[PDB]
């Protein structure tokens, strides 16, 4: 469980495991990766952070009760999925912000 | 109970930025705090990814829940003292939280 800095980790999400395959016709699953890692003090530019996150991580080093910045998706991409409308017609809809492209500390 | 914006006044003398920052003496930075419940309900400024992570978390604990982080940020202007001892007016983007959400 060793501490590491904020980055992107792989995650394949199979819809049958989540019970979504009842409504989603395709795909069976997708590579939706996830963000995880520590956002150290002082936080870097290269960690895709905001001035607020630099300030909050600083406030934490003085008051531990205030959390540091979370490692979160900063850049997301879309995926197309198929579903069945009311009259059994197949529909193709683009789902915004489904895949993590880059992580960052916020 | 859930993800919301909470007030956080940031005083520079308490933070140690007193030396380089001339004005203001601090500012109302605000901070995000709260639960990202399962299943993710409306009005929480979430992404579809956050809904997906949240649901995978309920089936696999190794995968964390979505974090409550700032989703909208505004700027503040500051007066700072540079290397040459001249007091400079600068704009600092993304300093104040305007809205929180589950990401
Ligand atoms: C800070 O944020 C930045 C910005 O987000 C992060 O840097 C970005 O990093 C990602 C890669 O991790 C990158 O996105 C790629 O762009 C390339 C452009 O040429 C593509 O080659 C690449 O496509 C593959 O991956 C995508 C999913 O990530 C898929 O949509 C696609 O099908 C491609 O897949 C290949 O590899 C996979 C392996 O999983 C395989 O399954 C595929 O079939 C195929 O072999 C990405 O779209 C950006 O280019 C980066 N931008 C910059 C400016 O560097 C940065 O790392 C963040 N910091 C932290 C700490 O996370
Ligand atoms: C989901 O995200 C949305 C989008 O971010 C969030 O909705 C926004 O919420 C904000 C914050 O309340 C709100 O922004 C205000 O707009 C007001 C007009 O409607 C302005 O009055 C206000 O400006 C004041 O506060 C700022 C900081 O927020 C200051 O920098 C500024 O100087 C202003 O100061 C006034 O009020 C303060 C009290 O804090 C006082 O000291 C001063 O004397 C002065 O009276 C904000 O900019 C947006 O209007 C919302 N947008 C929409 C579309 O609804 C939403 O809350 C999120 N959900 C969660 C859970 O976070």
UniProtKB/Swiss-Prot annotation, chain A:
Q: List the disulfide bonds.
A: 6-71, 35-103, 39-105
Q: Which residues are glycosylated?
A: 48
Describe, from its UniProt entry, the tissues in which this protein is expressed: Particularly abundant in lung, spleen and colon and in low but significant levels in heart, brain, placenta, liver, skeletal muscle, kidney, pancreas, prostate, ovary and small intestine.
Location(s) in or outside the cell: Secreted
According to its UniProt entry, what is the function of this protein?
Growth factor of the TGF-beta superfamily that plays essential roles in many developmental processes, including cardiogenesis, neurogenesis, and osteogenesis. Induces cartilage and bone formation. Initiates the canonical BMP signaling cascade by associating with type I receptor BMPR1A and type II receptor BMPR2. Once all three components are bound together in a complex at the cell surface, BMPR2 phosphorylates and activates BMPR1A. In turn, BMPR1A propagates signal by phosphorylating SMAD1/5/8 that travel to the nucleus and act as activators and repressors of transcription of target genes.
Give the family from UniProt. Belongs to the TGF-beta family.
Q: Name the disease.
A: Brachydactyly A2: A form of brachydactyly. Brachydactyly defines a group of inherited malformations characterized by shortening of the digits due to abnormal development of the phalanges and/or the metacarpals. In brachydactyly type A2 shortening of the middle phalanges is confined to the index finger and the second toe, all other digits being more or less normal. Because of a rhomboid or triangular shape of the affected middle phalanx, the end of the second finger usually deviates radially.
Spell out the subunit comment. Answer: Homodimer; disulfide-linked. Interacts with SOSTDC1. Interacts with GREM2, RGMA, RGMB and RGMC. Interacts with ASPN. Interacts with MAFP5. Interacts with FBN1 (via N-terminal domain) and FBN2. Interacts with type I receptor BMPR1A. Interacts with type II receptor BMPR2. Interacts with SCUBE3. Interacts with TNFAIP6 (primarily via Link domain); this interaction is inhibited by hyaluronan. Interacts with ERFE. Interacts with BMPR1A/ALK3; the interaction may induce HAMP expression.
- Protein name as annotated: Bone morphogenetic protein 2
């Amino acid at each position: 469980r060793l501490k590491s800095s904020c980055k992107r980790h792989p995650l394949y999400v199979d819809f049958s495991d989540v019970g979504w395959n009842d409504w989603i016709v395709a795909p069976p699953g997708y590579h939706a990766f996830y963000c995880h890692g520590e956002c150290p003090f002082p936080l870097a530019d290269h960690l895709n952070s905001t001035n607020h996150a630099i300030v909050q991580t600083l406030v934490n080093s003085v008051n531990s009760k205030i959390p540091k910045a979370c490692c979160v998706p900063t850049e997301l991409s879309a995926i197309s999925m198929l579903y069945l409308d009311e009259n059994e017609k197949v529909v193709l809809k683009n789902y915004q912000d489904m895949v993590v492209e880059g992580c960052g500390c916020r």
